[PDB]
Design a protein around this ligand. Structure first.
Ligand SMILES: NC(=O)[C@@H](N)CCCCNC(=O)CCCC[C@@H]1SC[C@@H]2NC(=O)N[C@@H]21
Lengths: 213, 216
């Protein structure tokens, strides 16, 4: 039972920059260390084994170093396909404990969200439900706030928000907001506004519809 | 080719037990261990244990000693992972990983994963609604997938034809039911002139739904 303290927890670098992740072992693990890359919704991929030996078909911009307890991974010419969570694992003792992980963000230029708002579908209405959906797509950085205004007044509850992980193609994020009402609360109001706040724009982005097109 | 073939998703009641499997093919080294690893969503990889196929000897992390039981069939080159006295804490994705040797080089292969959900809540098919806008060059269309349990569903557009421009979001649980959305962005010359369709599968309830995005 050896412990694996990995560092940093999160990182953010532009393509072409050089980054250095570190795993510390609580005892000596005599180079018996592997680094893995895990892409969202995919299995982990080996990068380096035995501390410094590159795995099959791994580009030379990757290299690991260190010895004893102190180990680190280096990436020199950071490329698009490198995003993800990097783990370390040891095989010295009988318990092959992983480090906690180092999640790697791709840094990109600021982008305002494309906001889109959608009234409840007729099918859902006709069953008695009414969800208003608002997408806030392809924005950067990750930090964002959305609020709902119904006939001018801020609405708190019913709202369910969800966020994607960084996009593999354009390195943006995207967010989804769902305000669920009953059909007959929905029909008691006309103006529904999805209002987004982001650092790209000092004045908030506003998308609305009237219940009567 | 060398590859690890796992079993399909599992749904089970609290207190029950389950037995996942992991098959291998074409490994050069017969002595390498099958290992099992637990991952909760947005959490770290967590080593469970391993087995030595030469003799059936196993090691476990103390946290899984008694919880996990790893078995093998070297006869068939398949290895199983039984979990017992299940709770919600055991809900996670479970990988089988195994190393291999050719010459003086190492190789690390991983299975696809095998999801395990532990809950007393009833299987429920999803209600899928289209999202067309009311009154730009590209137009964004949407799909709302609401009221299902358990995770996962799979969302595609035009039977997977529309692969770029897609954003499918993580499900959110509330009151024993998931709600999920997916957006697609396509050229204005494409819709409504052509048919754009939302495909949803929910294997747990054997549901397959196509929802056309009809305008207005
Ligand atoms: N037949 C043989 O080769 C035997 N002497 C060895 C049996 C091998 C059974 N053990 C395993 O599979 C566990 C694999 C541990 C990861 C390995 S240790 C060396 C290499 N460096 C790493 O960072 N990871 C790999």
């Amino acid at each position: 039972d050896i412990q694996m303290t990995q560092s940093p927890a999160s990182l953010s670098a532009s393509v072409g920059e050089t980054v250095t992740i570190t795993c510390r072992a609580s005892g000596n693990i005599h180079n018996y260390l592997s680094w893995f890359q895990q892409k969202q919704g995919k299995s982990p991929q080996l990068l380096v084994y035995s501390a410094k030996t590159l795995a099959d078909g791994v580009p030379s911009r990757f290299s690991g170093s260190g010895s004893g307890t102190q180990y680190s991974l280096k990436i020199n010419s950071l490329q698009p396909e490198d995003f993800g969570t990097y783990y370390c694992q040891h095989f010295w003792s009988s318990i092959y404990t992983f480090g906690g992980g180092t999640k790697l963000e791709i840094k990109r230029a600021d982008a305002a969200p494309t906001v889109s708002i959608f009234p409840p579908s007729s099918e859902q209405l006709t069953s008695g439900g009414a969800s208003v959906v608002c997408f806030l797509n392809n924005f950067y950085p990750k930090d964002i706030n959305v609020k709902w205004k119904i006939d001018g007044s801020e609405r708190q509850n019913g709202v369910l928000n969800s966020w994607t992980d960084q996009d593999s193609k354009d390195s943006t994020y995207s967010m989804s907001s769902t305000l669920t009402l009953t059909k007959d609360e929905y029909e008691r109001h006309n103006s529904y506004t999805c209002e987004a706040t982001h650092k790209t724009s000092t004045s908030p982005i506003v998308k609305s519809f009237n219940r009567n097109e | 080719e060398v590859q690890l073939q796992q079993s399909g998703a599992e749904l089970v009641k609290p207190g029950a037990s389950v037995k996942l499997s992991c098959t291998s093919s074409g490994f050069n080294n017969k002595d390498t261990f099958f290992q099992w690893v637990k991952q909760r969503p947005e959490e770290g990889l967590e080593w469970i244990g391993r087995i030595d196929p030469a003799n059936g000897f196993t090691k476990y992390d103390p946290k899984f000693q008694g919880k996990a039981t790893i078995t093998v069939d070297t006869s068939s080159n398949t290895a199983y992972l039984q979990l017992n006295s299940l709770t919600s804490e055991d809900t996670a994705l479970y990988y089988c990983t195994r190393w291999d040797t050719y010459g003086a080089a190492w190789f690390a292969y991983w299975g696809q994963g095998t999801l395990v959900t532990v809950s007393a809540a009833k299987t429920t098919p999803p209600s899928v609604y289209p999202l067309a806008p009311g009154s730009n060059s590209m137009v964004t269309l949407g799909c709302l997938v609401k009221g299902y349990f358990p995770e996962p569903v799979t969302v595609t557009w035009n039977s997977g034809s529309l692969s770029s421009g897609v954003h499918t979001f993580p499900a959110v649980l509330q009151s024993d039911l998931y709600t999920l959305s997916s957006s697609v962005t396509v050229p204005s010359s494409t819709w409504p002139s052509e048919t754009v369709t939302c495909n949803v599968a929910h294997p747990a309830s054997s549901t397959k739904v196509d929802k056309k995005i009809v305008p207005r």
